[PDB]
Design a protein around this ligand. Structure first.
Ligand SMILES: *[C@@H]1O[C@H](CO)[C@@H](O[C@@H]2O[C@H](CO)[C@@H](O[C@@H]3O[C@H](CO[C@H]4O[C@H](CO)[C@@H](O)[C@H](O)[C@@H]4O)[C@@H](O)[C@H](O[C@H]4O[C@H](CO)[C@@H](O)[C@H](O)[C@@H]4O)[C@@H]3O)[C@H](O)[C@H]2NC(C)=O)[C@H](O)[C@H]1NC(C)=O
Ligand SMILES: *[C@@H]1O[C@H](CO)[C@@H](O[C@@H]2O[C@H](CO)[C@@H](O[C@@H]3O[C@H](CO[C@H]4O[C@H](CO)[C@@H](O)[C@H](O)[C@@H]4O)[C@@H](O)[C@H](O[C@H]4O[C@H](CO)[C@@H](O)[C@H](O)[C@@H]4O)[C@@H]3O)[C@H](O)[C@H]2NC(C)=O)[C@H](O)[C@H]1NC(C)=O
Ligand SMILES: *[C@@H]1O[C@H](CO)[C@@H](O[C@@H]2O[C@H](CO)[C@@H](O[C@@H]3O[C@H](CO)[C@@H](O)[C@H](O[C@H]4O[C@H](CO)[C@@H](O)[C@H](O)[C@@H]4O)[C@@H]3O)[C@H](O)[C@H]2NC(C)=O)[C@H](O)[C@H]1NC(C)=O
Ligand SMILES: *[C@@H]1O[C@H](CO)[C@@H](O[C@@H]2O[C@H](CO)[C@@H](O[C@@H]3O[C@H](CO)[C@@H](O)[C@H](O[C@H]4O[C@H](CO)[C@@H](O)[C@H](O)[C@@H]4O)[C@@H]3O)[C@H](O)[C@H]2NC(C)=O)[C@H](O)[C@H]1NC(C)=O
Ligand SMILES: *[C@@H]1O[C@H](CO)[C@@H](O[C@@H]2O[C@H](CO)[C@@H](O[C@@H]3O[C@H](CO)[C@@H](O)[C@H](O)[C@@H]3O)[C@H](O)[C@H]2NC(C)=O)[C@H](O)[C@H]1NC(C)=O
Ligand SMILES: *[C@@H]1O[C@H](CO)[C@@H](O[C@@H]2O[C@H](CO)[C@@H](O[C@@H]3O[C@H](CO)[C@@H](O)[C@H](O)[C@@H]3O)[C@H](O)[C@H]2NC(C)=O)[C@H](O)[C@H]1NC(C)=O
Ligand SMILES: *[C@@H]1O[C@H](CO)[C@@H](O[C@@H]2O[C@H](CO)[C@@H](O[C@@H]3O[C@H](CO)[C@@H](O)[C@H](O)[C@@H]3O)[C@H](O)[C@H]2NC(C)=O)[C@H](O)[C@H]1NC(C)=O
Ligand SMILES: *[C@@H]1O[C@H](CO)[C@@H](O[C@@H]2O[C@H](CO)[C@@H](O[C@@H]3O[C@H](CO)[C@@H](O)[C@H](O)[C@@H]3O)[C@H](O)[C@H]2NC(C)=O)[C@H](O)[C@H]1NC(C)=O
Ligand SMILES: *[C@@H]1O[C@H](CO)[C@@H](O[C@@H]2O[C@H](CO)[C@@H](O[C@@H]3O[C@H](CO)[C@@H](O)[C@H](O)[C@@H]3O)[C@H](O)[C@H]2NC(C)=O)[C@H](O)[C@H]1NC(C)=O
Ligand SMILES: *[C@@H]1O[C@H](CO)[C@@H](O[C@@H]2O[C@H](CO)[C@@H](O)[C@H](O)[C@H]2NC(C)=O)[C@H](O)[C@H]1NC(C)=O
Ligand SMILES: *[C@@H]1O[C@H](CO)[C@@H](O[C@@H]2O[C@H](CO)[C@@H](O)[C@H](O)[C@H]2NC(C)=O)[C@H](O)[C@H]1NC(C)=O
Ligand SMILES: *[C@@H]1O[C@H](CO)[C@@H](O[C@@H]2O[C@H](CO)[C@@H](O)[C@H](O)[C@H]2NC(C)=O)[C@H](O)[C@H]1NC(C)=O
Ligand code: NAG
Ligand code: NAG
Ligand code: NAG
Lengths: 102, 215, 224, 132, 453
């Protein structure tokens, strides 16, 4: 079974900067998906097919990567962008990351 | 499987006029040129008809050629005895993307007289007896028709051990040639008083006989 | 413009047969097609491939397209054929041909002589040639049959010349037999007048190319 | 004369080969282009779509120098900045399918160049036969 | 010299990829069964015999069965032909009525249930004033309980009307040929091993396809075209478990199915010129309609597909099978149309096996529905008339449709299950070898010639 690994994860930063979370797969060849969950709300789709953005998505979220290694990079951090993030290849799932205000 | 169909064999009297038909489909014959080729047995083939009616130099105007729809035809006016051969139609085909040949048609010319066979019965060499073997050779040449019978025989009985036989093979004079070998040891050679090759051809039975006393 | 064939007559299974076609009297670069034709037992004729003389453009049978390759060398004035991973269906006689001039008084097509090629696992054999010495039962009415048995050669063929080909009159290379051992044996005789029996000498010059040997065996009369 | 020569293929038969050999046969690729209860509407709109396409092509060829020549030449020099290929290699190396991806960028301009060239040549020869 | 000039060429053989309509055409033998009794001769020009199938050298194109078009319009066209074959036939409006029902005369064990119910009711005669009392037979899957006494009604009479098919028009398939109009071509990959995606190195163009027989079946597709040598599995994304898996195997395996109960039809009149067909008396013992396949051929073919399937998932893998997981009726079992009557036949007896890393016949029982609803349209229910005599049919099982279970949490076994799903996959089993391309003439190339004044 394909297991995803999440990297750094617990990440505390200030507004106005850029940040990047990392994920690595146990099996290459497939695509990638990124999900945002805020506090006490319903999760929301950011990135499907490893580079494409959904509706209601500003383009300052940029996903990239190849093979097994994928990066999610947000430039120009805002207050609403502090949330929990998930990587997704198939029915499998990764553990998540944490964006906190520093 | 051949995409070009011919009836396999045909025969006719000398001086006759025959038509050899080559039957295929539209996809090969109906758009392309067809050719007619001639080969003897044991002989590389020769072109007779190119582009459905034309003959190269070196070939008589005795044959004629026609083509219609998905069928081709060669016509021999005044059949000669030389034309005992195998003839083929050939073209190129789109659906296979390849040149193809016909079924093959063996023209055996009638009127050939029945030729009584020539026989030759060889004993083994004394070298072969030094090699402790004995080959008895029955060569049957220059005979018509090609229905010949060979039988190897002992002193009073027949023998069929070590016997191998070539068929009547249509030679250059349109007659036939054939052979049979009787394979023994030199001790089995000197175990008998005679060895016979008795051939039956056109109801005629002729037995050549050697003796191991005659080496 | 004459066409001749060269190569081994026996090929091992799953291996690569190679053929060399040698051309005389003309260049290979001329505006003509050069083709390979094979003939199976039972006289099933089957086209293989052809290549244009000038630039070298090729066209094969698609149904064997994986395993066939055709090349041309203008330096040696030669055609070359290669077939990989042969099996028992590939036992055939091979000719190389030129298409012929598009004129009024052409000779027709130009045919080669041919190479017989056998696909087999058995090892080749140098022949045993024995002089068929004419007995008194062979010397009837001033004419005698004297020959050579080419026993146990593998594979075909053996070429039998008589006194190094200088005598061809009265000769006949009979059809060979196919033994139960799988080995070929042929008879090649010459009918000779009896008065020449005491003076002239008669070697059968038998050659077996797949074993690359030649046996020159003299036929001599001896009482027993 | 001919024992075995390349006869002809179906339409798009040569299209794997090089352009020099493919240019020998065009009429085959040209002839198989015209001809060979709601469904009748689909067949009729198919047929009129076919003749609409063919008539567009005939008109677009007519406004250049050659109406029905089927092979033309003209007076526009080849700029090598489009293709950067040698003459020796293209007629003996590449196919049209290979060619079309290479010349795909520089289209829709060459057509206008042909239009302007034919227009200016027609008005100049018009002036020539005007003084004639 | 170096002033190369442009030259335009008309009729350069080159194409592009496109999408358009197509053309339906069949043989001349279908016109012998006259007066449109079979469908697809309302809209069929007779095919011309021996069309060209021209071969090509070097040229190599890529294919893709999954985003391929023209299958969508095939799924449209069969539905449209089905709907066009019904409007000249009678409606069944006055049949929705209160039914007085009972059990048929049979020495019934109490725990088993009757598969046939015997009902009587009222119906209008040819006139308007007379009304008559009549009786017929029905299966249990068509009546339900309305709510002392005991009475039923039909299943469909609370959401829709109901249309009877005509007994003239037959149901057997016939070879439909597809053809391209003027100015296109159809390519065909003749490669021996081509899984279903990517480049194919030996192509051939064509004007019309081969014979295609449209059969409707949910699992275990029938009368199909088998592959050449091996057993081929094909899928879109294998590691994705949402997509089905198409298995085409080499040797066909025979299958028999039969219904043994002798049946007698009967013609009730509804009014002026309206016929209606009931199911009258039953002469014989009430047996159960079933299907037979051979044992060892089935086991050997399953061994074949295990041996071929092991390459896509590593060698040391336990592989097993299981029956369908659930859902509506016509996707658990497999379902077909033999002899002008529809069968739904249970398949749990075939998919129970497990496979380690290193004369008798199987039967399976079926059921018979009289009313059907294919394609699950919202207001379209179709009745089917009964037929006469014992019915049997023989066919060739050819392919298979499978679905992997989405197994997480570290298990080495990979079970497989049959799943019907769409009707599109049956056509995708046959149009996996054709894309449609559009001709483009008038190329343009530079050379050294120049037009004189
Ligand atoms: C996969 O493909 C196979 C092969 O075709 C199909 O099997 C055939 O299915 C058809 C159904 O269309 C069967 O055809 C039926 O055969 C009956 C028996 O015919 C025999 O008897 C007649 C009369 O004596 C002989 O003339 C004939 O030669 C046969 O020996 C017929 O009685 C049926 O016709 C009935 O319906 C028509 C409709 O109006 C009436 O006009 C007729 O009078 C008659 O009442 C029909 O012809 C056929 O037998 C099947 N087997 C074979 C070997 O062909 C499979 O059906 C298919 N797969 C699936 C799932 O369908
Ligand atoms: C597709 O085809 C398959 C293969 O046939 C079917 O699978 C079988 O389905 C039946 C469901 O009916 C399975 O269950 C069996 O049902 C019996 C019916 O129970 C009656 O008898 C009991 C008393 O025994 C009454 O109380 C009851 O009211 C019923 O009248 C059970 O009795 C069976 O139990 C058996 O096994 C247990 C455990 O060993 C024993 O204790 C019992 O004594 C008895 O021996 C049984 O549970 C049956 O098991 C399935 N077959 C197999 C091989 O597992 C599918 O049903 C069919 N698909 C569809 C949709 O029908
Ligand atoms: C597994 O499932 C996937 C779908 O989940 C399936 O589809 C293939 O996915 C790949 C993505 O890895 C597709 O490749 C793309 O194709 C489009 C076609 O135009 C290109 O535009 C893409 O370009 C990429 O790079 C660009 C550079 O800027 C980006 O801008 C762009 O957004 C893309 O990142 C890329 O090449 C592919 O087309 C599909 N389909 C097929 C048939 O391959 C895949 O087939 C399944 N199987 C496997 C083994 O993966
Ligand atoms: C589905 O039903 C069909 C019903 O037709 C059934 O097909 C038939 O099966 C029988 C038996 O399986 C076949 O009969 C065979 O006939 C051939 C040729 O005549 C024989 O070689 C066979 O046996 C004969 O010889 C035996 C001695 O070797 C004798 O003991 C024997 O009595 C025979 O004389 C064999 O019987 C028949 O040909 C087919 N017919 C068709 C049209 O297929 C099919 O088997 C059923 N399906 C399954 C899976 O059972
Ligand atoms: C199909 O493809 C094959 C393989 O590419 C083609 O064969 C190739 O034909 C070209 C002809 O232009 C050969 O190129 C030239 O060969 C000559 C030989 O003297 C050389 O002097 C040139 O410099 C150039 O290399 C090429 O060698 C040849 N390749 C092979 C493997 O045979 C074939 O023509 C194509 N078309 C058809 C219809 O088969
Ligand atoms: C259920 O089906 C049964 C048969 O499967 C039908 O029963 C038959 O109904 C007819 C009514 O006319 C009965 O005919 C009568 O039979 C007696 C017997 O002597 C005869 O005297 C009468 O003159 C008349 O012919 C017939 O007997 C009866 N069948 C049986 C077995 O009794 C019935 O119509 C169906 N419907 C129900 C029961 O609602
Ligand atoms: C088919 O049509 C017949 C004839 O029209 C129907 O028969 C009728 O059935 C009703 C109810 O079953 C009868 O009403 C009953 O009348 C009796 C005495 O008259 C009374 O005791 C009951 O309480 C009830 O009121 C009616 O009389 C009867 N008519 C005739 C002529 O028999 C029948 O119901 C219709 N449907 C079916 C499914 O059979
Ligand atoms: C069905 O046939 C297609 C076509 O042959 C197969 O698709 C191809 O699968 C191979 C893997 O065996 C892919 O190779 C991979 O390429 C990437 C490119 O960077 C490389 O990084 C990987 O390490 C690997 O080598 C190939 O790209 C892919 N596509 C094509 C056009 O060849 C497919 O696998 C076959 N089988 C199935 C079950 O679908
Ligand atoms: C696929 O396989 C499973 C396992 O064999 C099947 O499950 C079985 O389903 C039947 C009916 O759904 C169960 O029968 C039960 O009979 C009692 C008798 O009174 C009844 O009260 C129940 O309501 C039920 O009908 C049976 O117990 C069950 N077997 C097991 C082991 O749980 C399933 O039906 C199969 N799928 C198909 C489509 O056949
Ligand atoms: C028709 O068949 C049904 C089905 O067997 C019978 O229903 C049975 O009714 C009795 C008493 O009401 C119950 O004890 C049984 O358990 C029922 N069977 C089932 C399977 O539930 C019904 O009685 C039959 N009617 C007639 C007239 O024979
Ligand atoms: C199915 O039922 C019908 C109807 O009874 C049977 O047809 C009868 O066959 C016998 C024997 O030839 C005839 O005497 C009757 O006249 C036939 N009746 C009709 C209405 O045609 C048929 O044989 C049955 N099928 C079987 C027994 O397999
Ligand atoms: C079902 O399979 C049988 C064989 O299992 C097929 O029968 C062959 O059909 C071809 C084409 O008509 C014949 O040339 C063969 O002689 C038949 N027999 C065999 C043993 O190959 C049959 O075509 C398949 N399809 C149908 C619809 O029955
Ligand atoms: C029709 O009757 C069936 C019988 O169970 C029921 O399930 C369905 O909901 C009903 N539909 C309507 C619209 O009443
Ligand atoms: C299939 O056949 C093989 C060999 O006859 C046998 O070992 C195997 O057990 C069979 N399959 C099943 C499920 O029994
Ligand atoms: C499981 O497989 C075998 C053969 O089919 C048998 O033990 C059993 O009947 C199967 N299970 C079911 C539920 O039929």
């Amino acid at each position: 079974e394909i297991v995803l690994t999440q990297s750094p994860g617990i990440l505390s930063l200030s507004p106005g900067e850029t940040a990047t979370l990392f994920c690595k797969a146990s099996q290459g060849g497939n695509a990638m998906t990124w999900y945002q969950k805020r506090r006490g709300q319903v999760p929301r789709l950011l990135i499907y097919d490893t580079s494409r953005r959904a509706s209601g998505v500003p383009d300052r979220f940029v996903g990239s990567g190849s093979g097994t290694d994928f990066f999610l990079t947000i430039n120009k951090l805002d207050r609403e962008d502090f949330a929990v993030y998930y990587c997704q290849q198939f029915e499998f799932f990764g553990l998540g990351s944490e964006l906190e205000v520093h | 499987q051949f995409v070009l169909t011919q009836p396999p064999s045909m025969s006719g009297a000398p001086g006759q006029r025959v038509t050899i038909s080559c039957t295929g489909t539209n996809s090969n014959i109906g758009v392309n040129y067809v050719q007619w080729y001639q080969q003897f047995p044991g002989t590389a083939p020769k072109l007779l008809i190119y582009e459905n009616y034309k003959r190269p130099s070196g070939i008589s105007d005795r044959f004629s050629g026609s083509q219609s729809g998905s069928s081709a035809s060669l016509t021999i006016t005044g059949l000669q005895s030389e034309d005992e051969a195998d003839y083929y139609c050939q073209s190129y085909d789109i659906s296979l993307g390849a040149h193809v040949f016909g079924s093959g048609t063996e023209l055996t010319v009638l009127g050939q007289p029945k030729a009584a066979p020539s026989v030759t019965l060889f004993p083994p060499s004394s070298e072969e007896l030094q090699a402790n073997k004995a080959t008895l050779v029955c060569l049957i040449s220059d005979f018509y028709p090609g229905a010949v019978e060979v039988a190897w025989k002992a002193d009073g009985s027949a023998v069929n051990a070590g016997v191998e036989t070539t068929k009547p093979s249509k030679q250059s004079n349109n007659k036939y040639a054939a052979s049979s070998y009787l394979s023994l040891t030199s001790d089995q050679w000197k175990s008998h008083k005679s060895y016979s090759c008795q051939v039956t051809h056109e109801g005629s039975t002729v037995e050549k006989t050697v003796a191991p006393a005659e080496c | 413009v004459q066409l001749q064939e060269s190569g081994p007559g026996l090929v091992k299974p799953s291996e690569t047969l190679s053929l060399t076609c040698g051309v005389s009297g003309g260049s290979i670069s001329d505006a003509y097609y050069w083709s390979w034709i094979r003939q199976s037992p039972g006289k099933r004729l089957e086209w293989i491939g052809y290549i244009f003389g000038s630039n070298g453009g090729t066209r094969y049978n698609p149904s064997l397209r994986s395993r066939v390759s055709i090349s041309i060398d203008t330096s040696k004035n030669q055609l070359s054929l290669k077939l990989t991973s042969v099996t028992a269906a590939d036992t055939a006689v091979y000719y190389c041909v030129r298409e012929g001039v598009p004129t009024e008084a052409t000779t027709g097509d130009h045919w080669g002589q041919g190479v017989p090629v056998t696909v087999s696992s058995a090892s080749t054999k140098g022949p045993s040639v024995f002089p068929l010495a004419p007995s008194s039962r062979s010397t009837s009415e001033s004419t005698a049959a004297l020959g050579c048995l080419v026993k146990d050669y593998f594979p075909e063929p053996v070429t039998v010349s008589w006194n190094s080909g200088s005598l061809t009159s009265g000769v006949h290379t009979f059809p060979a037999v196919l033994q139960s051992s799988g080995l070929y044996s042929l008879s090649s005789v010459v009918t000779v007048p009896s008065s020449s029996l005491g003076t002239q000498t008669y070697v059968c010059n038998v050659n077996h190319k797949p074993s690359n040997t030649k046996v020159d065996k003299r036929v001599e009369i001896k009482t027993c | 004369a001919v024992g075995i020569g390349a006869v002809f293929l179906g339409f798009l038969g040569a299209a794997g080969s090089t352009m020099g050999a493919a240019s020998m046969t065009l009429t085959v690729q040209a002839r198989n282009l015209l001809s060979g209860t709601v469904w009748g509407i689909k067949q009729l709109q198919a047929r009129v779509l076919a003749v609409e396409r063919y008539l567009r092509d005939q008109q677009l060829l007519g406004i250049w120098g050659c109406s029905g020549k089927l092979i033309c030449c003209t007076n526009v020099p080849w700029n090598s900045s489009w293709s950067n290929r040698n003459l020796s290699e293209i007629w003996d190396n590449m196919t049209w399918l290979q060619w079309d991806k290479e010349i795909s960028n520089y289209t829709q301009i060459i057509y206008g160049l042909l239009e302007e060239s034919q227009n200016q040549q027609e008005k100049n020869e018009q002036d020539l036969l005007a003084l004639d | 010299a170096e002033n190369l000039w442009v030259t335009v060429y008309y009729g350069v053989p080159v194409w592009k990829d496109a999408e358009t309509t197509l053309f339906c055409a069949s043989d001349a033998k279908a016109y012998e069964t006259e007066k449109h009794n079979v469908w697809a001769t309302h809209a069929c020009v007779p095919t011309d015999p021996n069309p060209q199938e021209i071969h090509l050298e070097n040229v190599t194109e890529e294919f893709n069965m999954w985003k391929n078009n023209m299958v969508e319009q095939m799924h449209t066209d069969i539905i449209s032909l089905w709907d066009q074959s019904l409007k000249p036939c009678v409606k069944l409006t006055p049949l929705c009525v209160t039914l007085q029902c009972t059990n048929v005369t049979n020495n019934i064990t109490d725990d088993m249930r009757g598969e046939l119910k015997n009902c009587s009711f009222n119906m209008t005669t040819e006139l308007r004033d007379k009304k008559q009392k009549v009786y017929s037979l029905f299966y249990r899957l068509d009546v339900v309980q309305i709510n002392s006494n005991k009475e039923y009604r039909l299943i469909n009479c609370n959401t829709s009307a109901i249309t009877q098919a005509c007994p003239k028009v037959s149901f057997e398939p016939i070879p439909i040929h597809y053809c391209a109009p003027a100015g296109f071509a159809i390519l065909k990959c003749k490669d021996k091993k081509f899984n279903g995606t990517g480049p194919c190195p030996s192509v051939s163009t064509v004007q019309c396809t081969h014979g295609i027989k449209p059969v409707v079946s949910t699992q275990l597709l029938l009368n199909g075209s088998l592959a050449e040598e091996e057993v081929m599995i094909r899928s879109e994304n294998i590691t994705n478990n949402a997509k089905n898996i198409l298995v085409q195997f080499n040797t066909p395996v025979q299958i028999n199915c039969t219904r043994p109960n002798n049946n007698t039809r009967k013609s009730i009149r509804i009014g002026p010129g309206q016929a209606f067909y009931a199911t009258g008396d039953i002469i014989g013992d009430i047996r159960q309609a079933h299907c037979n396949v051979s044992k060892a051929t089935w086991n050997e073919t399953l061994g074949k597909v295990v041996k071929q399937l092991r390459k896509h998932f590593g060698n040391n893998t336990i592989i097993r099978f299981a029956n369908s997981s659930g859902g509506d009726l016509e996707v658990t079992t497999h379902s077909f149309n033999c002899g002008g009557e529809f069968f739904y036949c249970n398949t749990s007896g075939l998919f129970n096996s497990t496979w380690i890393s290193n004369n008798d016949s199987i039967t399976l029982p079926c059921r018979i529905k009289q009313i059907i609803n294919m394609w699950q349209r919202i207001g379209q229910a179709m009745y089917a008339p009964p037929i006469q005599g014992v019915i049997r049919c023989v066919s060739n099982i050819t392919g298979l449709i499978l679905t992997r279970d989405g197994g997480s949490t570290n298990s080495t076994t990979e079970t497989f299950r049959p799943g019907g799903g769409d009707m599109r996959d049956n056509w995708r089993s046959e149009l996996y070898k054709y894309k449609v391309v559009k001709i483009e003439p008038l190329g343009v190339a530079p050379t050294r010639c120049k037009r004189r004044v």
